[PDB]
Structure 1
Amino acid sequence: QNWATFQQKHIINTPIINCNTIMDNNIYIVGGQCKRVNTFIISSATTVKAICTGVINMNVLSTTRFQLNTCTRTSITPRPCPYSSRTETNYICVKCENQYPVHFAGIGRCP
Structure 2
Amino acid sequence: QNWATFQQKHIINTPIINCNTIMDNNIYIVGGQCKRVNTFIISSATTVKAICTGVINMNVLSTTRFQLNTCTRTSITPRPCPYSSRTETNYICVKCENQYPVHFAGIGRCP
- Pick the TM interval, shorter chain: over 0.9
Q: 1:16: Cα distance to partner?
A: 3.1
Q: Which runs of 5+ in 1 are unaligned?
A: none
Identity of aligned residues (%): 100
Q: 1:77: Cα distance to partner?
A: 1.8
Q: Output the CA distance in 2 between the equivalents of 1:55 and 1:34.
A: 31
What do you get for the CA RMSD once the two structures are aligned? 0.9
Q: Output the CA distance in 2 between the equivalents of 1:58 and 1:83.
A: 30
Q: 1:17: Cα distance to partner?
A: 2.9
Q: 1:49: Cα distance to partner?
A: 0.3
Q: Output the CA distance in 2 between the equivalents of 1:53 and 1:88.
A: 25
CA contact (8 A) 1:16 1:22 kept: no
Q: Which moved more, 1:35-44 or 1:15-24?
A: 15-24
TM-superposition CA deviations, 1:46-104 (whole Å, max 9, x none): 11001111111111110121010111111122221100111100000001111100111
TM-score under structure 1 normalisation? 0.95
Q: Which runs of 5+ in 2 are unaligned?
A: none
Q: Output the CA distance in 2 between the equivalents of 1:15 and 1:70.
A: 10
Q: List 4+ stretches of structure 1 deviating above 2 A.
A: none
TM-superposition CA deviations, 1:18-70 (whole Å, max 9, x none): 11111111101011111111100011111100111111111111012101011
Task: State the aligned residue count.
Answer: 111
- Matched residue, 1:97: 97
TM-score under structure 2 normalisation? 0.95
CA contact (8 A) 1:59 1:95 kept: yes
